[PDB]
Each structure stands twice: as C-alpha cells, then as structure tokens.
C-alpha cells in the first residue's frame, strides 16, 4: 500500500559529501519515525541513524559519530540523510525504514537490525579512485 | 433563638505577617456535633 | 511531626516516563494546599505545580505545561505526579511540600518562590543515561 | 489650599538613624491615604513607602523592606517616616503625598508611579559626609 522511494548516490570520492533524500507518498512524516540502515556486500545489514515520532530527536551509530547528520522536513514530508567525509569503507546500499511510534530507544529496546513494517527499494553508493 | 448581636471587623494587621500566624488553631476533627454553647479542648488522635 | 517524604527517580531516558509519589506522614491532604518544587543543579528551586485543598483545582508553569500531570488521592493520603515526554535539562532534585489552605493561585497571590510551611527530604531525577 | 510640609533631614554618617515629618495643612489624615516618595539626583521619582485611609495598612518597595517604619498620630496631625540603618545610595528629596480614599493596594492596583493629587514641596537628605 505504502511506498517508500529513495533517491541520490552516484560517484563519490573520499573527502566529498552527498545527500540521499527519503519520500513516503502515503504515511505522514513527525508522527512516524524513520531511519536508515545499510548493507554492505558480505556483511549483515546494520543501522545508520535514526529520528523519533517527538520532534528531531536524532540517534546515531558508533561508526556514524560527527560524520553522519539526519533531518527531517515535513513540508514536502522527505527526510535527508547528510554526508561528510566519506572514507573508502562507507561503500554500501541504503534503505530508509518508517515504524509508527516513537520506535527508537523507547526503554529497553534499540533499532536493532530490521523489525520496521515500511521499507523501500535502496540506492548504491559507492565510493573509490 | 439568640438574643445578641454579632461585631466583626477585618484584622490583617496584627493576626498575620510574612511567615505565616500559626497561633490560631482550627479544629476539623470531632467525633459527634457540639451541644450550643458547649467548647472541647482535649487532644486526641482522630483516625479515619 | 508533619514529614513529607518522596518515592521514585533514579535512571531514565529522553522520551521515556517516571512516577512520583510524596505521602504525608502528618497531617492529611484534601486539607493543606501541597505542590511540588525542582532544583537544578548550580540553580535556584523554582516549582512546578501544585493542587488546591479543595476540589481538583491545577496550576502548572509555562515551560512544562501539557507535559507533565499532577493528580491525588485521598485514601492511600499521597499525591502523585506522572511525568510525560522527559527532555534533557529537567535533572533536578524534586521536592514536595505543603500549606494550610488554597495558597497557589489565591485572589492577586500565586505561589511565588519558597512561601510553603512545609519541606520534604527530596529525590534525584537524572536523564539522558 | 491643601499643603504639605516636608520637616527633617541632615548631614550624618552611614548606619545612622533619623526622623522625618509630614504635616497637612488643609485636610486632616486618617480619612485620606496617604504616602511617601524620593526623588535621587538624575532619577526619575518613585515611591517609598503607603499607607490607607483607615487603620494601620502598611506597604514597602522592593529594596526598602526591614530598613523603615511608618506610623501616623491625629493628635499631632502629622506623619513619621523613620529611618533606620541607611546606606550611600539612600541621598534624595524625600516628598510627601496624600490621596482621598485607600488607594494603597487598592484591588489589582498599587500605588504605582506617582497618580497621587496633592503635592508638598520636600527635603533634601544626604549620607556620607
């Protein structure tokens, strides 16, 4: 019923910066709460950041610190995800996930792997010489 | 059937000051309504 | 003789929720006007709510108003507090206390500063773990 | 037809102790209100100290509690501010006004600015010789 449509990506080198931008067409955006998670080739997929339903609360990785900045505008109800500094190892697809709720840190309970009932489809970003 | 008369005038000037007058004690607590002209001045633990 | 001692507080997280009690072991409530006063750290103790002697009559300040929620109950004799949407700066030790009769709010008298006759110990209310 | 003269004032020391008098030539006190005002050097005129009609009502400004008395006698038709434990910034023309009616605290109002209808002509006091 609900789709989630990511855009961006492209050719990065280390030292640039890119914005990826997330539009849900259906659900409404500041009552319900989206993130992001990546996936590497080879690995097992792992989370980026987070924001609440409750105003811009952010969450963060321990990877992601200081590098990784997440916004949300609900004028044309699309969240950014904005990054700097890429190094040679952030090469990975991105999906953008919304859960209703104030999902993330609520107790006892981080946005650990993928239990989110909204998905989409991913970009590529890569990055290289 | 009272014969009397009633005089009241306001005291906030000698009856109260910034901490608060604690010298006047009203009592809430009694076991059965008083008989007319009747007072009750002993202190004793009212449970509920 | 009159001893206005304070249960809860302790570790919580932004966004969460936490319950305060204060049960007087004097003398009882829908008599005596109570409220409740914080104390930030390096800061002056300012209150921050209170509940009249009669009926269910509530006050609240212009920073925490909506939030959180006051409420009593006569026969367990104890006054309850429910916090709601726990942000970063309202790490305070938390204070409950109590006077004769309808004191907040009373003709051109609010509760301004610290005019109650009774003070409690306090509990320590800590966010953001 | 209605006068007021301003009697007292002098040279003397920090910390010391005065008296000052407030008499009414036409009407009589203790049916009009009345109250005290200062005048500093290059400071606008403000308030000291009011009293009502009736009884013994009694009022101060904010950085002037504990340190002046008021009292007035209709025997001697006149007004005694005294003056206790004074400080160097305490130097200005002390003006005495009266007004019909208790307007001191009168409802939702004090006695702010200078509303007040009869005037008197004052004294100069000064401090630190």
């Known amino acids: 019923q609900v789709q989630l449509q990511e855009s961006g990506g492209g050719l990065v080198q280390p030292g640039g910066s890119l914005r990826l931008s997330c539009?849900?067409?259906?659900?409404?955006?500041?009552?319900?709460?989206?993130?992001?998670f990546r996936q590497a080739p080879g690995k097992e997929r792992e989370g980026?950041?987070?924001?609440?339903?409750?105003?811009?609360?952010?969450?963060?990785?321990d990877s992601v610190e200081g590098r990784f900045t997440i916004s949300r505008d609900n004028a044309k109800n699309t969240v950014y995800l904005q990054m700097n500094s890429l190094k040679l190892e952030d090469t990975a697809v991105?999906?953008?996930?919304?859960?209703?709720?104030?999902?993330?840190?609520?107790?006892?309970?981080?946005?650990?792997?993928?239990?989110?009932?909204?998905?989409?489809?991913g970009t590529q970003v890569t990055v290289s010489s | 059937d009272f014969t009397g008369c009633v005089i009241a005038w306001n005291s906030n000037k000698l009856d109260s000051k910034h901490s608060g007058n604690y010298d006047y004690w009203y009592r809430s607590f009694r076991k059965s309504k008083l008989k007319p002209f009747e007072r009750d001045i002993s202190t004793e633990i009212y449970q509920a | 003789q009159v001893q206005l001692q304070e249960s809860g507080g302790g570790l919580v997280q932004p966004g969460g929720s936490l319950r305060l009690s204060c049960?007087?072991?004097?003398?009882?409530?829908?008599?005596?006007?109570?409220?409740?006063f914080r104390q930030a750290p390096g800061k002056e103790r300012e209150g921050?709510?209170?509940?009249?002697?009669?009926?269910?009559?509530?006050?609240?300040?212009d920073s925490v108003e909506g939030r959180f929620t006051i409420s009593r109950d006569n026969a367990k004799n104890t006054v309850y507090l429910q916090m709601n949407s726990l942000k970063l700066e309202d790490t305070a030790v938390?204070?409950?206390?109590?006077?004769?009769?309808?004191?907040?709010?009373?003709?051109?008298?609010?509760?301004?500063?610290?005019?109650?006759?009774?003070?409690?110990?306090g509990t320590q209310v800590t966010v953001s773990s | 037809q209605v006068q007021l003269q301003e009697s007292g004032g002098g040279l003397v020391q920090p910390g010391g102790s005065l008296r000052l008098s407030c008499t009414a030539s036409?009407?009589?006190?203790?049916?009009?209100?009345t109250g005290w005002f200062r005048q500093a050097p290059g400071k606008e005129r403000e308030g000291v100290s009011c009293?009502?009609?009736?009884?013994?009502?009694?009022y101060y400004e904010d950085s002037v509690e504990g340190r002046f008395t008021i009292s007035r006698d209709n025997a001697k038709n006149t007004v005694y501010l005294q003056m206790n434990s004074l400080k160097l910034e305490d130097t200005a023309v002390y003006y005495c006004?009266?007004?019909?009616?208790?307007?001191?605290?009168?409802?939702?109002?004090?006695?702010?600015?200078?509303?007040?209808?009869?005037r008197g002509q004052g004294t100069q006091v000064t401090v630190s010789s």
């Open positions: 006004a009266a007004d019909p009616g208790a307007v001191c605290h009168s409802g939702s109002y004090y006695y702010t600015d200078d509303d007040f209808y009869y």
């Open positions: 036409g009407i009589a006190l203790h049916t009009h209100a």
């Open positions: 009293i009502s009609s009736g009884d013994g009502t009694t």
